[PDB]
Homo-oligomer: A and B are copies of this chain.
Amino acid sequence: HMHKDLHSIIDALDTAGRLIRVRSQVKAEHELAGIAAKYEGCDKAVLFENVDGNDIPVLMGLYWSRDLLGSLYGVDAVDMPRFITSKISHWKSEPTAHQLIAREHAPVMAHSPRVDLLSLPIPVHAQKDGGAYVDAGVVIAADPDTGVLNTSIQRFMVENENTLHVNIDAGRHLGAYLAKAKAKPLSFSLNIGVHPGVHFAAATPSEVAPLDVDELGIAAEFQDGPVRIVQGDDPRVTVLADAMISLECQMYADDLADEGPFAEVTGYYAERAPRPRVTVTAVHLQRNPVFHSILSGQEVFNSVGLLGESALFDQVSKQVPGILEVALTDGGCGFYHAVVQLKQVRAGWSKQAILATFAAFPPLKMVTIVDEDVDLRNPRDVEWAMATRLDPERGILRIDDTFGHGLNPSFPDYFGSKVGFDATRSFPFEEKHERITYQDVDLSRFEIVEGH
């Protein structure tokens, strides 16, 4: 239950019967995403064997099911956030140095075609996206002053066969490396089709891996041995050796061009706007490459939740007794709604739980508290707790004129109202709140023919 590269992942899923093979030709324009969308969240990923008759198939839906990611590493969905955090803890304490290897030993260097981005089966995802996007690509970039690596993930729109437009949010480390090159232009690699270890490294936030620190070793914790890197053609750049595809890239500061729209976590479009142009100097491919794309939605909600929930749980359980679990729900875009599950020990702690949760995660708009006997990850069950347990008069806590996330239109200019729901039963516990229960039953113990 360790994985060197995406091949390992796909074979494991194929073997486990968690792969949906779409054998028919599909169009990269809208149709592909449309099919993915009908499968979003189920316990399987989707391999498209034939995209506009490309030789390169595309994989989508790797991240939309915690059960699936858990199956790849032998952990239950519920234990995955702790699993990932424990591994990032081990990396902080004893990092694994990368392994630099010779160009002709690096599977990704198998081929180097003339740079033609339009030959790649890059999907146009949502119906109003400003073009085809690579959105599962991990950027590796060296500090122009200190050569220290930074690993981030960023959306790149294809303009033409050799140009991408990239979105770099404010205070991103890639942004800061560009500021340094602009005291001299910035080279880097874009590594598409990487294993979850690289993905989690890329997505690890600033306060876990500072600017002056190399987060890429996080990936080493999800594979035997160290992360394999290789000198690019550049040579100011470093390439991920076990990537399916890798693009050597260069970008000048103060050189902007219209990119977007694209889906944001909110489920709304980004504003099309002048953002940095990046020019693709070279292209490397394994033989038998699969192109890896992410469907905006649960794939992104789980990336954020799996990395963020353990810290949040740690911060709340430290300030409040009886905390069991914290969910950054998919309904809340893995960012705007937290459900906190606790075992009450005294009246009043449920309200402290609301304060602690809002204090620990500034983007949150809603917090809901529920008891140990409600499934915090089932929105039906939280709705039920709201319907039978919430006192609307004393259990709704509203915070005005506070800081929040500017992308969410409930928070214009990072400012608005937050609301907590205390959907706990009354304490001390009373019979009128004891839920009915059906005997738990192993279905494998019976012969059951289900449809035919």
Contacts and interface: CB of A to CB of B under 8 A. Distances in A.
Nearest to A413: B347
B397 A399 contact: yes
Contact of A403 (B347, B362, B415): B347
A414 interface: yes
Interface in A335-372: 346-349, 351-352, 355-356, 358-360, 362
Nearest to A356: B359
A415 B347 contact: yes
Contact of A415 (B319, B320, B348, B415): B348
Contacts of A431: none
Contact of A401 (B351, B355, B362, B401): B351
Overall SS of chain A's interface: mixed
A362 B351 contact: no
Contact of A352 (B319, B403, B413): B403
A127 interface: no
A402 B358 contact: no
A424 to B, nearest CB: 11
* Copies in the assembly, this chain: 2
A303 to B, nearest CB: 22
Contacts of A394: 400-401
Nearest to A347: B415
Interface in A303-355: 319-320, 346-349, 351-352, 355
A415 B344 CA distance: 14
A404 interface: yes
B359 A352 contact: yes
Contacts of A413: 347
Nearest to A397: B399
Contacts of A414: 346, 348
Nearest to A404: B348
15 contacts: A346-B403, A346-B414, A347-B401, A347-B403, A348-B401, A348-B404, A348-B414, A351-B399, A351-B400, A351-B401, A351-B403, A352-B362, A356-B359, A359-B359, A397-B400
Given A319-B360, A347-B401, A352-B358, 19 more contacts: A320-B359, A346-B403, A346-B414, A347-B403, A347-B413, A347-B415, A348-B415, A349-B403, A351-B399, A351-B400, A351-B402, A351-B403, A352-B359, A352-B362, A352-B403, A355-B358, A355-B359, A356-B359, A359-B359
In the A-B complex, the 8 residue pairs with the closest CB atoms: A348-B403, A351-B402, A356-B359, A355-B359, A348-B402, A359-B359, A348-B415, A355-B355
